[PDB]
Ligand binder design. Sequence first.
Ligand SMILES: CC(=O)N[C@@H]1[C@@H](O)[C@H](O)[C@@H](CO)O[C@H]1O
Ligand SMILES: CC(=O)N[C@@H]1[C@@H](O)[C@H](O)[C@@H](CO)O[C@H]1O
Ligand SMILES: CC(=O)N[C@@H]1[C@@H](O)[C@H](O)[C@@H](CO)O[C@H]1O
Ligand SMILES: [Ca+2]
Lengths: 668, 477
Amino acid sequence: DAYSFTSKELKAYKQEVKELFYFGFDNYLEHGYPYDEVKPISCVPKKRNFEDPTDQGTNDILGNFTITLIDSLTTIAILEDRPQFLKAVRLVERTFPDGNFDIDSTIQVFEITIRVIGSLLSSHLYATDPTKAVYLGDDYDGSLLRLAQNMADRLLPAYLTSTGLPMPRRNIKRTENNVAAMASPMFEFTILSYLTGDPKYEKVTRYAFDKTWSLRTGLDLLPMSFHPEKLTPYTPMTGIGASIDSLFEYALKGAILFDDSELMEVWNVAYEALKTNCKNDWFFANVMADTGHLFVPWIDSLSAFFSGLQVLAGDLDDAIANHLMFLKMWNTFGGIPERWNFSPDNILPLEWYPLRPEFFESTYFLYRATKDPFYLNIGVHLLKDLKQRFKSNCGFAGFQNVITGELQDRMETFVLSETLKYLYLLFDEENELHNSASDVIFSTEAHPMWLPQEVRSNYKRNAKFLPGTCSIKPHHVIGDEFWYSPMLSNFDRLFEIDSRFAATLIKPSHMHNYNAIELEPGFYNRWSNPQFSTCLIPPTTEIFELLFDLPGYHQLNPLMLKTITFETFGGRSRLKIEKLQIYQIDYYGDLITASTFQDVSRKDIFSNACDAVASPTYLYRVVAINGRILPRHGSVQIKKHFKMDGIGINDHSQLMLECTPIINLFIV
Amino acid sequence: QEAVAPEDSAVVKLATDSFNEYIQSHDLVLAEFFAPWCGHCKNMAPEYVKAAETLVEKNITLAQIDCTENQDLCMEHNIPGFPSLKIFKNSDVNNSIDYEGPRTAEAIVQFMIKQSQPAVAVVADLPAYLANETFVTPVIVQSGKIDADFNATFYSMANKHFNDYDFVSAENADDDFKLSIYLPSAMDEPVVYNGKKADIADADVFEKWLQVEALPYFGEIDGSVFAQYVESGLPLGYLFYNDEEELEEYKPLFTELAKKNRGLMNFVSIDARKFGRHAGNLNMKEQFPLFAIHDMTEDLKYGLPQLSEEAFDELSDKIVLESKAIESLVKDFLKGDASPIVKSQEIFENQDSSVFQLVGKNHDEIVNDPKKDVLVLYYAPWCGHCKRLAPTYQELADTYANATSDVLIAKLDHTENDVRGVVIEGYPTIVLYPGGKKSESVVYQGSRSLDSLFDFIKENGHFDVDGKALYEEAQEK
Ligand SMILES: CC(=O)N[C@@H]1[C@@H](O)[C@H](O)[C@@H](CO)O[C@H]1O
Ligand SMILES: CC(=O)N[C@@H]1[C@@H](O)[C@H](O)[C@@H](CO)O[C@H]1O
Ligand SMILES: CC(=O)N[C@@H]1[C@@H](O)[C@H](O)[C@@H](CO)O[C@H]1O
Ligand SMILES: [Ca+2]
């Protein structure tokens, strides 16, 4: 019954993940407590580095307030174990009997906000919600809410800047800041405002978020880092990776949770910019904010969350394509390296894998969207890897360096908070979060959030200080299939990444024995359709992209007829064209035949010079526009309502590049 | 693996230049056009090598072509993708049949052995041939004197169903014509044809008779053999069993049913351990043993009542399906009185919130009511936009619930509930069902704002309840 994924076997895996989380949490309680974390290899507390203030890498995360316990509160709540949650809440109260975080620690506002405040707010919601199986009722007295409010009060002074943007670090007892740090806190602080009824948190943090969004450039791409006082971008680099991810995440999630139209519009604009400029076939590359040109040849591991974010936004196909790349990265290295070059070990600049949950989060959300046992198999293999390689004497340790296989002696709080939580939820089909609530919004640290309607109404009343849609099914899903996984069987480009980036996907020495997750014989022999489980011939043709800086405004959602219609073409438009040569394999795996070149007009009816040139060797085909990969036989028409050299229009109304018509691009 | 057969292995590596010569110098050659990179060929390689080792004893050669190296050869054959298992016969490079069965050593070996033999095997004595070799597929035999037209249609079908079955021709002048099918499961029992001789000569009649009577009475169902049951067109009755002992317990009754209901519906046994999720795909809960009847023609699932999840968890004794219950369900389905099972969650008896959670079972009943106006929102729990709408939907439902009690506000989880007769091209989809005996459903297109929804309900509602004023009248208080 291996890899059959019945309800009973899923319950077994869920129990295994529960036992793993309890192993880690009990080890922390026994050894690390009362300190922030417990070192897994050495079985000793990982105390805050009091002696060396300069060590902001460790000091920022560790404020010496049992951050692991606070973060694990929400994980315990999701486990639906009332006794354990009550015990943890009582332990938190005992650690902070006065109800305040009077700890002399210089800490990072963003990380602390997402972890301690997020966990406290979600735990309070769980404790005060009668529906939840972890309801405390009389035993609870708002202590978690008061602690969260105290921490928020201590952190708020960070926003008392000239421009209203928060300072990167602050001392709770008493220059460069990334956009994610500047803006993301607003989600948690607005939830806090709703719960307490105090508008100040929401007002200040929302203003900071709005300023951060306004800092975007003309392309609607936000540079990752900024100087709050000078408002000068340190790096033109931008993307969906670390330091900017939480901004988009919380823009969309706040739009969803607070029913805010401004946040939803911000998300729409930012997401359209990302699709136009950053998006590629298998990942969102990192591009210059001002120009949109590729900046660095690597994609960081933090960006693996965007598949889940897109699942939330309703773009299943993009999420699947992006998640497949990180699946291949795990297959190659056994752990998603911090950074990885797609264009050429030495390939990985930063190669430590701290056991980040983003891949787990994406797998969980994609399984929820598609219900495909492909992602269940991914989760099973991740659990096996945890137990066999990451599990240690007193916790779970990630790779210090995937190239050599060394395991670092550190258990980050996000491990217990997010990785185990998402794995359990992926295996816990019957969890109340998705079976019953159906409206929860996970925070960036995987803390469930939801504002009760009474709280919403009270906050709205007492103040004192076309639309979007979701795709029903992925494109690759064909008809109905009961026996086989649609991803394995029907995703023709499933293994295209292996060939396309074979140069940079080099298995380290310790990875030689490991087989590809999707190719596990037990899983493959069961969840693969022999009729359709077929590779796709790679494109041998030349593929190049050009930029169209046409004046006007950019249409956020061009309407789909197998045709994409562009009423307006203003702003930069990244068009991915394919050169067509006779007897060659195209982007879609079909052999180019002479009929393609038959009845071709190279003459420019809008000009005269091109006519002499026309009086062929190759044609041009558009395969993706503004990041939207066209379907097979996919035409594109742009409404007329040109000056740029080398552009022409023929009798058939197909734009010419270099006097060469583009078969599927039209100008109507 | 590496997707490339080892050199010591029987597999033959064929290059661009050496492919044509090898094909011309060998009668039957199964060529695999693979690629070292993508893993379908990687999982193919072990079973392919085993099949090559087995086939070498019988002189059938297996070849491997690496499209990454022999590009031109691969385009010349119009390879769609990898692995493409193509069969070359009679030293003909132009002619290339495509392998279709499962990618297993046993399947490949059987397919190639069949390809080696002629379409129809002529045997002097039937019993000798039957005993000589064991068969893994049904054997169709045209014993006795054969009419010319029937002979032609029989050979045409054999060519058509070359891979599906093995056809045998044992012509005897004295013995009368006797078409038969030998099921491998029961080689003793032949399925003799009792219809008139004229119609069976028709290709369609023979095709239907094969598609119906060429299936095991109570065989083990699996994805590979699913196409055989789909082609028959009859309803399929699944039996989930936890262990072989359970299957042996249930075998007599189900074999009797399959024999008795032959030509009406098909009964199969599905290993619950291997295929538990199929039970969910059949609109039945994973509580085995479990009998579910699937009607692929109409897409209607019928099954025995199942214990509730809470009762199942409390339950500690193995579930047993009553034979009388199974027979009664089968009879009701055949008559047509049996009611289908619609994919639906448990009926939300307790409705704490104003929004009336609709499940698949009660959906059509609730919306079709003419006494009230129903505004169903179709949502997926994962989709963000529906979560965004939930607060406004709750406010609107609260506003209408206390006002005139004539407009019902509900929502249905489309991912967990299948609603038949409603077109949902995305999420969220807000559909207003106006009151009255006959009133076509209206789909909401405007921005999903509170005032917009109120105006939509008023304008397209049969009872013309003005929600917005009711909202204001509650607002003033
Ligand atoms: C600076 C320091 O070590 N402070 C610790 C604190 O981390 C711990 O939670 C508390 C409980 O005993 O005891 C304090 O002395
Ligand atoms: C038993 C044996 O070796 N038979 C071979 C046969 O496989 C081959 O196709 C043919 C032409 O080369 O020559 C025969 O002798
Ligand atoms: C009596 C008999 O078997 N006749 C067959 C005929 O049906 C078939 O079409 C032909 C082609 O192989 O071969 C003959 O021997
Ligand atoms: Ca995150």
